[PDB]
Ligand SMILES: NC(=O)c1ccc[n+]([C@@H]2O[C@H](COP(=O)([O-])OP(=O)(O)OC[C@H]3O[C@@H](n4cnc5c(N)ncnc54)[C@H](O)[C@@H]3O)[C@@H](O)[C@H]2O)c1
Ligand SMILES: NC(=O)c1ccc[n+]([C@@H]2O[C@H](COP(=O)([O-])OP(=O)(O)OC[C@H]3O[C@@H](n4cnc5c(N)ncnc54)[C@H](O)[C@@H]3O)[C@@H](O)[C@H]2O)c1
Ligand SMILES: NC(=O)c1ccc[n+]([C@@H]2O[C@H](COP(=O)([O-])OP(=O)(O)OC[C@H]3O[C@@H](n4cnc5c(N)ncnc54)[C@H](O)[C@@H]3O)[C@@H](O)[C@H]2O)c1
């Protein structure tokens with residue numbers, strides 16, 4: 001698959017994370033413009049240098065929980081490239097916190113980043129969305145299988161699935177809204193939990209391996225591409241068969 | 246059918262609402278103890294009086310979005326009845342708000358009541374949950390069909406479905422955690438045509454499914470959210 | 481719950497099975513009339529005798545894959561009790577058969593019993609169904625999780641879920657059509673199963689019957705088209 | 718959208734149908750070898766000529782309901798191209814038949830073509846499937862929404878969804894098994910339905926249009942491509958938002 005994104009503009013939050021980096025690389029290689037935001041301004045700027053074509057790249061330090069940063073992100077997209085073709089709210093946190101130990105602060109921090117932030121970005125982006133544009137949300141296996149020790153994480157990822165359906169109705173026919181639901185992907189997000197459970201996870205997985213960040217990115221690219229022109233409201237499971245939904 | 250909830254205690258938020266009253270009514274008729282909360286104390290107290298078994302009913306003014314009121318709600322259940330058998334976080338708001346017009350305040354108010362509040366009640370309730378207890382969440386057709394002009398509402402009701410699955414895992418085997426997803430509960434003609442059962446649902450038809458999930462008839466059901474919508478949508 | 485099924489009639493195939501017997505026992509204890517069918521006539525009659533209200537029980541030898549036996553089953557319900565309130569096509573086979581080893585006969589046998597048979601029973605039952613009646617199909621965890629070595633079985637139980645939705649539309653508002661999808665029912669790999677099951681036990685057949693009874697009852701009067709997972713949380717669908 | 722399928726072999730039943738033709742065109746344009754089957758061989762060969770790189774196309778008259786024709790189809794793929802990379806059992810029938818009027822013959826006809834035939838093709842294909850191969854089934858909106866007057870059709874398409882999950886477990890990791898669930902597609906299958914129901918369908922569809930056959934083919938191609946390399950067991954809704962599943 002080869003994506004033709006020349007002169008199409010991607011806004012991607014959490015761009016320095018494992019899946020975020022894979023998304024940026026694939027879209028950049030496909031000729032797209034990138035507006036990358038992240039809470040870690042130093043890593044993002046350094047990472048962007050390696051992908052380097054500054055004519056097609058703009059970066060900004062942005063907190064997913066900040067409504068004003070969503071406004072800055074859209075204004076930068078409008079100023080640099082004149083609009084938005086693809087919107088991907090990838091920024092999120094994954095905290096292991098058994099429910100009996102979950103503090104009110106624990107709960108609010110996960111909802112603010114994983115859910116409120118997605119609202120802020122989608123809402124501020126509306127005037128900048130172009131014809132044939134795409135929003136792609138990031139759900140998770142946990143929304144479908146049920147989180148083991150992360151009821152707040154699971155809640156926000158179930159919210160992603162339904163929010164995708166709602167916005168798919170409201171922004172049609174101009175904009176399509178879809179999602180990707182990753183399974184177990186090897187990134188720093190999962191590194192500590194997964195180091196003693198790699199064999200167990202592969203044994204449970206029909207494809208017998210962990211997912212790669214690029215295998216999430218390629219599905220996001222598909223959903224943004226003309227190959228998905230009649231797909232809207234839909235969240236796709238990308239988990240090697242570890243779970244059937 | 247017929248439920249035997251004698252000496253078992255229901256905690257119900259938003260108890261003065263349409264579905265809320267139906268739930269309180271059924272569980273009360275079933276012999277249960279009731280701890281009812283609502284933002285409208287006066288309306289609630291009048292309703293609770295109409296059921297007339299005051300020794301089995303306790304009411305309190307509680308804002309579903311307030312963690313302090315959740316603590317007071319659980320303490321009241323502990324004080325009057327010693328624990329919680331059924332926890333039903335029913336309180337919620339349904340605001341029609343096209344997404345292009347949705348304010349940050351619009352968004353937060355719906356998340357705070359419909360989602361944060363469910364976290365507060367469930368978390369504070371943990372020490373009070375008895376053996377064989379149930380949590381039953383209220384999802385919505387909108388979670389599955391996609392809301393037409395209520396993206397914040399749909400988000401919170403998709404969150405209920407996944408949060409139900411998460412807590413079912415963590416609170417098992419002592420407590421089962423399930424949900425009910427109501428359809429259209431009493432352009433009516435279009436709805437009748439679209440509904441196989443050709444009518445609107447009654448609040449009593451949501452309450453009876455909640456009671457089923459709380460009953461021993463559902464003893465091997467957990468994590469599950471049931472569609473109660475007359476066939477208007479298949480999920 | 482306690483179900484009031486007096487003067488209401490259940491037609492149940494595979495009634496001598498583990499789940500089948502639990503359904504019959506519950507409905508009979510609830511006052512219902514029973515039309516029980518099974519391929520094993522002697523075992524069924526012995527079971528039916530134990531319930532002891534022979535005026536409320538009628539049995540017949542019937543092959544679920546036989547359209548003629550479906551016709552005979554409904555005629556028996558008509559003759560003894562005048563109609564059908566609850567139709568539960570419970571008969572099914574579960575064959576372990578890795579796909580690379582699956583014969584054409586293996587495939588056909590499972591489709592014939594688990595899928596063709598449900599069609600024949602539902603189709604022939606239509607004139608006998610009463611008002612406020614229910615059909616409750618039996619799906620399976622395998623339909624949702626994906627069968628490990630039973631692709632034919634899994635296909636038939638996915639068919640149940642979609643056929644339930646279809647008949648729900650067509651047979652409403654007179655009849656509601658729903659399903660129950662059992663998980664792992666005691667009816668080894670026990671350590672593995674307990675580890676994956678939040679409730680930390682196998683399901684009991686009586687716990688499938690009580691959900692079917694719920695779906696047949698007025699408590700489910702606004703539920704149609706719906707298949708309920710009854711699996712102790714082993715799988716979330 | 719364009720894919721790179723050179724030297725990979727597609728076996729496609731019902732190749733002369735609306736969606737079938739769109740699948741064949743895309744894969745051929747993408748450099749694949751085609752083994753096309755249909756009950757209407759004159760139609761198929763006439764169609765096969767128009768795409769014409771004829772050395773990369775092999776056609777055969779084959780009845781999906783025949784186990785022997787499935788063997789002949791696989792044998793042709795083996796003889797001409799040495800194996801099978803993509804297996805797409807697209808042949809199917811759609812009969813409007815109210816359940817109260819449905820004959821036993823009606824039932825068996827639909828289960829035989831739409832379900833037994835898929836078994837015959839998948840089972841006979843096993844020895845010929847190559848590394849990194851894909852099976853992609855065709856489900857339907859009817860499996861999820863519930864057919865209005867086609868309980869046998871709805872049953873077979875629900876079977877596709879569950880059979881896809883089962884085979885993804887058994888044929889992994891060598892083969893991924895996925896599905897596509899089309900909505901309302903502009904095709905002969907829907908000409909009769911949409912003569913009286915066109916207004917309602919566009920009203921109910923967020924994208925406010927009928928789907929095109931090519932918009933099913935592009936999603937099938939995605940599932941066969943490396944972009945879906947971590948997707949198995951999965952059936953994707955391609956319905957313009959008319960139904961959220
Ligand atoms: N296995 C997996 O990694 C997995 C599985 C399922 C779903 N997901 C989801 O996919 C998304 C991306 O995962 P990932 O691998 O990139 O995660 P990650 O933890 O590796 O990276 C997330 C990135 O977001 C940044 N970030 C954190 N808080 C932020 C904030 N307030 N504002 C802005 N940026 C912030 C982090 O610095 C990091 O660069 C997340 O939403 C995650 O929940 C991941
Ligand atoms: N048709 C329906 O009513 C319908 C359909 C689908 C889902 N649901 C869901 O079912 C649940 C119950 O619905 P209902 O019929 O009782 O709704 P309702 O609108 O009739 O209930 C409103 C009640 O909740 C109270 N309330 C409002 N905000 C509150 C707060 N902050 N704290 C405490 N109480 C508060 C109000 O005072 C009132 O008594 C809700 O979660 C709703 O979203 C309802
Ligand atoms: N663990 C489980 O038992 C389980 C799990 C998931 C789903 N289900 C499904 O639930 C349903 C009921 O299961 P069960 O516990 O009764 O199964 P079972 O194997 O205990 O019951 C088999 C019974 O069906 C009868 N039978 C077999 N072939 C028949 C035919 N051709 N015609 C008529 N009767 C026939 C046999 O005589 C026997 O009494 C089945 O459809 C099954 O696939 C069962």
Ligand SMILES: NC(=O)c1ccc[n+]([C@@H]2O[C@H](COP(=O)([O-])OP(=O)(O)OC[C@H]3O[C@@H](n4cnc5c(N)ncnc54)[C@H](O)[C@@H]3O)[C@@H](O)[C@H]2O)c1
Nearest residue numbers: 731733734735736737756780781808809855857899902906
């Ligand atoms: N709108 C749609 O067309 C639509 C929507 C949802 C799902 N689907 C499914 O997608 C698949 C492809 O549909 P389509 O648009 O190609 O349908 P179609 O009706 O256009 O295809 C008919 C073609 O299949 C052939 N065919 C019929 N019976 C056959 C048999 N026994 N053996 C072999 N070939 C046979 C016919 O000769 C003809 O060439 C089918 O499984 C269909 O159910 C279609």
